Amino acid sequence: ATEACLPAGQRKSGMNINFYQYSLKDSSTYSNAAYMAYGYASKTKLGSVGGQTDISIDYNIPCVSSSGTFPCPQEDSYGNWGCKGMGACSNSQGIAYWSTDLFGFYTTPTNVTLEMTGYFLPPQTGSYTFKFATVDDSAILSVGGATAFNCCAQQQPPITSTNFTIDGIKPWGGSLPPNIEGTVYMYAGYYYPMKVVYSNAVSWGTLPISVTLPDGTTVSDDFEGYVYSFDDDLSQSNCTVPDPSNYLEVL
Ligand SMILES: OC[C@H]1O[C@H](O)[C@@H](O)[C@@H](O)[C@@H]1O
């Protein structure tokens, strides 16, 4: 059984996103599992943004072309290099770029590690299939009070579990990986801790996130209505529900 929670605080819509420093073109750290699970929090914290419901990542580097600077979708890049419908680009793909494209926070989306935390509120009892359509460069998803973070303790330092529900790595220089899926059985009305950790090491960043509900509904990119944050309250006695199927409910 995946451990779930019943936080009694004021619920806030969306996930908290923390940003951590990652070295441009570090082709090692991003593929290490200890780093993805907890090691990232050792790195300098750049900032955070709260209340985000649209959590898919799609960052496209600029092409500085003769008619202006425009983002280039990765599948339209060619040669050394240009972008279809724009011609040759005069800027390097291998430098840092600054922009707000990740959740409105000004940082270097070319090279950053994001930590997304919240609680997933299932509306139906049954098995949920989470999915990353692909990943550039690496990402994990963990779900559960024992594996994502502890109940009522969303904002604490990371727990030390490498038991990921999904983990994905783009091999360095390789093509984008295919779909990656992971299934969790969840009970309706319990808040399940959820953590996504995402790294971009250079240039393009991509992480299309979706979930398929037990009825076969698919929710893609925007998780409004499903993900919530609560401020930590370590004093709330009955926050943790080790097994929601045998939980003595008291009303
Ligand atoms: O895989 C390493 C590197 O390969 C290409 O340069 C792009 O797909 C980048 O997004 C990626 O970081």
Ligand SMILES: [Ca+2]
């Ligand atoms: Ca990349």
